Design a protein around this ligand. Structure first.
Ligand code: 5AD
Ligand code: SF4
Lengths: 527, 772
């Protein structure tokens, strides 16, 4: 027949590999060749894959033999599987009180697309997954985690992302339902009450190690921050796009830069970690001001956020930019010019700031004018090497990508500690790194809760240092070392009586063995 | 009384034990939003749900029929555990309420005069009924780990005459086992006596088996790790240890937990079997009445039945169902997202399997011995609030919508496939025109084949009646559509975009009685490939459309969208011929137009909104444009909700209903000028929401049906000036939540009036009234 011999070929491959691996012996010819020698007796197009054979192993043998094919730390060991979901399409808040929507957001509810949420084009993989789930969080989460399971990953720490427009502009009942649904699809609990859902997810297997909620500076007030900390949010993503007030004004942005900075301060003093969006090639900017703002961003001790997202301005049909690009009022950059600009910007990224992404993955056939290729960071790093300078980004110095791309191993770990001042607070940045090769092995941020901006009833009662983020990628007793040094710092360097770590609800038990007791939404510990 | 609930259509909840079946008199009771619901699945005339026992306030999680007793316990997310007793042979009345736990109640299992309640705070409370009166007293409450183990499932058994076990599954890979004795006024010797181990993940559900052999029985525990584990409970003198003085070399996973209940009933619970390969979680599992068959209902849209191998003493897949392509709340791709709780009961030679379909609809499977299994009719109903109830043009069928993204076409079952009319008309779900991607709000009938709907968006779509449902209705309900077989074929769910395509090219005939359906459609068919193609969407609105109406002329359709200012509180009118719009607007309101009605005479349009003011617009016969004719300033103090047009025979007169707890009837007058001054007014105790008036005159008085915000429906007769209370509907025959839509059926079959009710209690009711 056509395909039956393929199924029985996979079956014999599975049984033979299990038998060989029980006593500790490897294969010889990368089973696909052995697969064909039996299944392609007539050569009827039977093409297996690694996922195909993985979905054949029996459960008892699957759960024990699967990770013996993957070894990248963040891939299967650290296992922070970024599982992105989307909310129902809706119109972003500012449109009401200004008159029109942001002038560069493609898609939405009233664009040429009837189906994609705001700032989305309904062609990214996430959009098709959302629509094939009809924007329901339960199906989204279950399907994504199941697809990840099928592809042979041993995922154990799901990290949620809530993409799409401003999620914070929805009726409170709807958001409560969304978050409860996410946690339920993770843990398996089938309840409806946010408190119970959190309490169940905390014990859950497949821990919800956090959740990110991209939002707007205005919709991040005290009450909104309390809401998102109730949900379990751990990292915020804030739209900025410009430090020049004129650009924000001309883009129908609807929020002043001063508002952005105030929101940064109060959120970082609420224990969050903020990742900001920074659009180059905004109208009326030019290369000189582009470089100026990106050089000030890390120089002004007011923004200095921990993450970043460089999103070069892409014009797409239907936006407010098509009725301005067609008239020729605005012309984009040049390919070489923009690659060089990205190179110079990345040259200035301090070691603590992590570059989470570069230019959007909106498809080439749809963009009217902007970035040509889709591998901008590749060319940026090549041009960086050409110029001589090098990148200090966390993502460009973490162990995991090095072991598979650079194929360089770490052997000179040493303790390094930065100590800067951002958003009115004193932020320490501990790390275990490789000074000779500039490889970051583990990191931990830390902040002295500033009197001016802190507001949480847990923090204003007594002096407090917040462990805003702890991350270990590639014996291996590092989290312990970093946590101990942070304790020492908060006891002597900071003079704080109670040190508390914000944590995703999934990982709240890990700090339990460290002696932390659960206070509100934080894992705290007195000193 | 002359008012009887003809049909109820409620959707099951999504918890893991929403449903339970009364065995000695097979009756399936399942939670549905705020209420419970009764059902006979083996009625000779195939009726679905017939009574919704209200009384809770939040979603009903767990319902359990106390075996060998006339009791059933229900648990609500509003921290209430209620006990219900059979009063009628087929009805129950609440007797006892337990308010405690300050939290949601998750697990809830009951035995004769002995129930167990698991509180999500992490407590297990055993309750024993008082001997003297039918009332439960809190016997004993205890906790495990106090901050780590929260319960997920519970089940208990009567091991001896006055000794009881309790198996707790929860946020732990170890099943806890407690034992106690009953002292006829309480319980004692209670503590966790064992922690069975062998699971690696959470324990979703567990269930003991009947002690058909004294001294030994079986307990199954299904986990989230796609495993099931069978444990052998052996009482004293049957424990059958291993002689240890000669080394038998037992494995550690075969450890036997021995414990003393009081001091002497040595129980030697030992693991017995490992059931493999469920492909996803085990949402619900349940034994059989007699045979040694175990039913496992999984979350991979699949349900299967294991039995011991007759050869090797192990367990294999006896039966499996659910392989028909579907995904519970979706249908494009299956795989993780299907079946909730399961019930398994046998009639004469018929093993009925009953299962929640993650869409508010039950699914039946009747099989004769072990192999030949076929789908029997189930029930349906929305899971979210139901908003609009549009009657077919002459009351032939009922179109319903919901806040859940679905609209559904119901009709009564009258003519069998043979041809002769049946005995009693049973209503069934006949089509699902829209599996949409927006919060469906406002639907209205264009004609027998066309219907226009609008959910949560700036546009509104018109659909035609496809060949499948139309032919099948003509077969069953015997509907006459002028035989016009130029209607498009049955549609599908689009795998691209949202506008409902024709489905001619793709569908993965049936109208004929020789097809696979001899009864109303089946769930797989209904949700996968019984949709409706779309004709045209009608742009023009800015915000989400809120209210919609059709003029009787079937030319102009009047629409409005939710707003907050005058520039968006305008009303648009669309011509059905070109599907385009009218040029001007009719702006008087400033808030969202709640109800918008077209008169019996197609020349007067009634608008009403949150401005607490109504308005009436003329119509230009020549140009199909409207202009302001009448307006009001303070006809009500609070908001107005719905306004309705009285029959032309009673004259040019309409009515408004408002949150002043009041309703005002306005009839035209010409003494100082032309206007419709308030001829009548009534005031109720609760805010009134919906009002419906029969199109037909009866004995010089119109029939006005009003609906309250707590669900109590009133029927009134209105002559000139005076309003006569026909009746009010008792608590047994009303929804538990706010009434959102009331519509009198234009049809009158067998001398009865049908009233369509759609409530926020996730339920649509059909009422029959006798008036000849
Ligand atoms: C999602 C992030 O991308 C920004 N953004 C908005 N429009 C575009 C576009 N056309 N291309 C790239 N990024 C864009 C949003 O403003 C936010 O900063
Ligand atoms: S600019 Fe911000 S608020 Fe405006 S559409 Fe884009 S994401 Fe939404």
């Amino acid at each position: 027949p056509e395909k039956e011999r393929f199924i029985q070929c996979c079956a014999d491959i599975t049984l033979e590999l299990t038998d060989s691996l029980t006593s500790g012996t490897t294969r010889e010819i990368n089973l696909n060749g052995l697969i064909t020698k039996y299944s392609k007796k007539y050569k009827l197009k039977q093409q297996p894959r690694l996922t195909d054979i993985i979905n054949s192993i029996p459960d008892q043998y699957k759960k024990y033999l699967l990770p013996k094919l993957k070894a990248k730390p963040v891939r299967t060991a650290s296992g922070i599987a970024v599982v992105a979901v989307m909310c129902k399409p809706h119109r972003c808040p500012h449109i009401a009180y200004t008159g029109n929507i942001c002038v560069y957001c493609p898609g939405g509810p009233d664009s040429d697309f009837e189906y994609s949420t705001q700032s989305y084009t309904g062609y990214e993989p996430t959009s098709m997954r959302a629509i094939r789930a009809r924007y329901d969080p339960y199906e989204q989460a279950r399907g994504r985690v199941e697809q990840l399971k099928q592809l042979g990953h041993s995922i154990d720490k799901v990290e949620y992302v809530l993409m799409g427009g401003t999620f914070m502009s929805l009726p409170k009942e709807y958001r409560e339902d969304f978050i409860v649904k996410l946690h339920n699809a993770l843990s398996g609990f089938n309840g409806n009450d946010i408190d119970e859902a959190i309490l169940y997810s905390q014990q859950s297997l497949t821990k919800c190690v956090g959740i990110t909620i991209e939002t707007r500076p205005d919709y991040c007030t005290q009450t909104h921050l309390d809401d998102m900390l109730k949900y379990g949010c751990t990292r915020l993503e804030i739209g900025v796009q410009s430090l020049y007030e004129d650009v924000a004004r001309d883009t129908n942005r609807g929020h002043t830069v001063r508002s952005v900075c105030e929101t940064f301060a109060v959120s970082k003093d609420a224990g969050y970690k903020v990742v900001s969006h920074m659009m180059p090639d905004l109208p009326n900017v030019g290369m000189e001001r582009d470089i100026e703002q990106f050089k000030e961003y890390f120089e002004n001790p007011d923004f200095r956020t921990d993450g970043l997202k460089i999103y070069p301005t892409l014009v797409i049909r239907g936006t407010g930019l098509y009725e301005l690009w067609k008239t020729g009022r605005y012309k984009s950059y040049s390919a070489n010019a923009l690659v060089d600009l990205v190179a110079r910007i990345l040259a200035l990224v301090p070691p603590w700031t992590r570059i989470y992404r570069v230019q959007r993955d909106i498809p080439m056939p749809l963009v009217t004018s902007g970035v040509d290729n889709g591998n901008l960071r590749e060319l940026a790093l090549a041009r960086m090497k050409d110029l001589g300078t090098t990148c200090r980004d966390v993502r460009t110095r973490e162990v995991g990508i090095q072991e598979v791309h650079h194929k360089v191993q770490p052997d000179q770990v040493e303790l390094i500690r930065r100590d800067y001042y951002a958003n009115g607070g004193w932020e320490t940045f501990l790390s275990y790194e490789d000074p000779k090769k500039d490889i970051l092995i583990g990191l931990l941020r830390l902040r002295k809760a500033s009197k001016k901006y802190t507001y949480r009833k847990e923090f204003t009662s007594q002096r407090t240092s917040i462990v805003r983020e702890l991350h270990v990628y590639g014996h291996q007793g590092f989290g312990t070392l970093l946590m101990e040094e942070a304790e020492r710092i908060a006891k002597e360097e900071h003079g704080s009586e109670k040190i508390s770590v914000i944590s995703g609800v999934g990982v709240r038990n890990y700090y339990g063995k460290l002696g932390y007791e659960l206070d509100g939404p934080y894992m705290s510990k007195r000193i | 009384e002359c008012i009887t609930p003809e049909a109820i259509f409620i959707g099951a909840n999504k918890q893991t034990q929403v449903s339970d079946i009364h065995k000695v008199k097979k009756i399936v009771a399942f939670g549905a939003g705020k209420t419970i619901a009764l059902w006979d699945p083996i009625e000779p005339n195939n009726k679905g749900v017939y009574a919704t026992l209200k009384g809770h306030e939040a979603e009903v999680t767990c319902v359990r029929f106390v075996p060998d007793s006339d009791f059933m316990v229900s648990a609500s997310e509003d921290h209430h555990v209620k006990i219900w007793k059979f009063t009628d042979y087929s009805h129950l009345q609440c007797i006892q309420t337990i308010q405690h736990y300050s939290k949601t109640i998750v697990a809830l299992s009951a035995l004769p005069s002995l129930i167990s309640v698991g509180c999500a705070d992490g407590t297990i409370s055993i309750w024993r009924q008082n001997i003297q009166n039918d009332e439960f007293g809190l016997a004993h409450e205890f906790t495990i780990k106090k901050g780590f183990f929260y319960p997920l499932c519970l089940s208990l058994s009567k091991v001896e005459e006055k000794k009881y076990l309790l198996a707790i599954g929860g946020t732990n890979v170890n099943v806890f086992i407690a034992s106690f004795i009953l002292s006829d006024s309480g319980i004692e010797k209670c503590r966790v006596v064992a922690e069975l181990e062998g699971h690696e993940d959470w324990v979703k559900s567990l269930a003991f088996r009947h002690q058909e052999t004294p001294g030994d029985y079986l307990l199954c525990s299904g986990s989230q790790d796609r495993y099931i584990r069978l444990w052998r409970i052996r009482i004293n003198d049957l424990i059958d240890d291993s002689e240890e003085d000669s080394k038998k070399l037992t494995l550690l996973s075969n450890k036997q937990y021995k414990f003393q209940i009081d001091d002497e009933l040595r129980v030697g619970i030992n693991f017995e079997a490992l059931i493999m390969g469920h492909d996803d979680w085990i949402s619900s599992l349940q034994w059989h009445e007699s045979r040694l068959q175990l039913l496992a209902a999984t979350a991979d849209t699949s349900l299967m039945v294991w039995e011991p191998d007759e050869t090797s003493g192990i367990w294999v897949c006896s039966l499996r169902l659910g392989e028909m392509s579907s995904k519970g709340a979706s249908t494009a791709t299956g795989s993780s997202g299907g079946f909730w709780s399961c019930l398994w009961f046998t009639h004469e030679r018929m093993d009925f399997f009953l299962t929640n379909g993650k869409t508010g609809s039950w699914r039946m499977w009747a099989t004769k011995d072990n192999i030949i299994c076929d789908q029997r009719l189930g029930i349906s109903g929305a899971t979210k609030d139901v908003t609009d109830i549009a009657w077919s043009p002459s009351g032939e069928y009922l179109l319903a919508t919901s806040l859940d993204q679905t609209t559904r076409l119901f009709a009564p079952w009258i003519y069998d496939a043979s041809g002769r009319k049946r005995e009693i008309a049973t209503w069934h779900e006949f089509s699902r025109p829209q599996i949409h991607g927006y919060d469906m709000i406002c639907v209205e009938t264009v004609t027998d084949t066309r219907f226009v709907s609008g959910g949560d968006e700036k546009i509104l779509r018109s659909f035609d009646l496809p060949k499948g449902v139309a032919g099948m209705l003509q077969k069953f309900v015997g509907i006459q559509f002028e035989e016009k077989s130029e209607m498009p074929d049955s549609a599908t769910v689009p795998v691209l975009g949202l506008s409902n395509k024709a489905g001619e090219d793709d569908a993965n005939d049936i109208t004929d009685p020789l097809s696979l359906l001899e009864c109303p459609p089946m769930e797989d068919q209904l949700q996968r490939h019984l949709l409706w193609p779309e004709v045209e969407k009608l742009y023009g609105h800015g915000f989400e459309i809120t209210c919609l109406d059709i003029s009787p002329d079937q030319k102009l359709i009047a629409s409005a969208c939710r707003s907050n200012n005058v520039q968006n509180a305008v009303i648009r009118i669309f011509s059905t011929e070109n599907w385009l719009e009218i040029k001007p607007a009719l702006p008087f309101h400033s808030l969202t137009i709640t109800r918008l009605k077209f008169s019996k005479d197609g020349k007067f349009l009634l608008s009403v909104c949150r401005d607490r003011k109504w308005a009436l617009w003329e119509r230009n016969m020549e140009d199909n444009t409207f202009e302001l004719r009448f307006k009001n300033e303070k006809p009500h103090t609070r908001i107005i909700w719905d306004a309705d047009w009285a029959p032309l025979e009673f004259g040019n007169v309409f009515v408004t209903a408002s949150r002043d707890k009041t309703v005002k009837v306005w009839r035209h007058q010409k003494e100082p000028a032309d206007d419709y001054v308030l001829e009548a007014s009534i005031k109720h105790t609760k805010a009134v929401t919906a009002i419906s008036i029969h199109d037909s005159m009866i004995r010089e008085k119109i029939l006005i049906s009003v609906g309250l915000e707590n669900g109590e429906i009133y029927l009134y007769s209105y002559t000139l000036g005076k309003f006569e209370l026909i009746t009010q509907l008792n608590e047994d025959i009303t929804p538990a939540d706010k009434i959102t839509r009331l519509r009198w059926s234009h049809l009158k079959r067998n001398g009865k009036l049908f009233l369509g009710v759609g409530s926020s209690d996730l339920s649509t009711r059909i009422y029959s009234l006798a008036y000849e």
